Amino acid sequence: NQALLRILKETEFKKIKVLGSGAFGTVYKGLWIPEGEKVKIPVAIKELREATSEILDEAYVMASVDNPHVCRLLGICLTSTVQLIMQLMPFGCLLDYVREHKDNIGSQYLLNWCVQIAKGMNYLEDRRLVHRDLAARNVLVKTPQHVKITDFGLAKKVPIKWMALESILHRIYTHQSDVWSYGVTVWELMTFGSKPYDGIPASEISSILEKGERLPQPPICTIDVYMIMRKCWMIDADSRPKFRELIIEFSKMARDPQRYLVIQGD
């Protein structure tokens, strides 16, 4: 379906402010002004490094993602470089959000985020799509009660500390290895943005995983919640929970939020 992806001219969008920078490229805050519309849509713009060699085929797939908890590719600008246009999420990423609001985040917010992230991942799995880079930094906040998974499709700088053990050792990526990354993302949220395995070099992560060591229990987590994270990090990938079951588990817990998370002043 070609029309779901808009091909933009360079005159249609302007870059206003830098939001983040890395080896991938740069993400800008900008404005999209389609020619005959007289509207100014706030957008985020990611300019990829020059190719030196297909990604339009992946762009159409990213444009067809149709779920309230996964970011959709709004448009693409094809020159020597490739620039991706998406809706601006005005509250930033969930990683920065839980760090800045570490004092006043209730259990209902946290468990609802876990549900929405699982809903987005379950949608991707039903489309037979693997994300490969699920992390708290890659969950964006449209509104505090509405989050979206971003950066889907960029895979087609290794995020070792979020990867399943079989991804580190065998470079095997499946939906069950996404579940492992989901467990680390939830651990990031429950610790209000702590760095996983802080201090340990990335070259030693596969070793400590092989010895049975996992991320510690967050203090606000009852054992009921922590055992869900623990099951996401089982070596046998098929034993890990499925995103379908994670939606059901966290939905039941979001109905009685104080029973499952112990937060000061909740």
Ligand SMILES: *CCC(=O)Nc1cc(Nc2ncc(C(=O)OC(C)C)c(-c3cn(C)c4ccccc34)n2)c(OC)cc1N(C)CCN(C)C
């Ligand atoms: C976790 C770091 C972060 O995301 N910081 C951030 C994010 C945003 N909002 C926003 N909106 C859309 C997109 C996006 O879809 O980009 C696609 C790839 C075009 C992004 C975004 C996505 N990736 C992969 C990023 C990497 C780095 C930076 C942003 C993105 N982000 C805003 O909007 C204001 C700000 C923001 N920073 C400045 C943090 C806000 N401070 C107030 C903390």
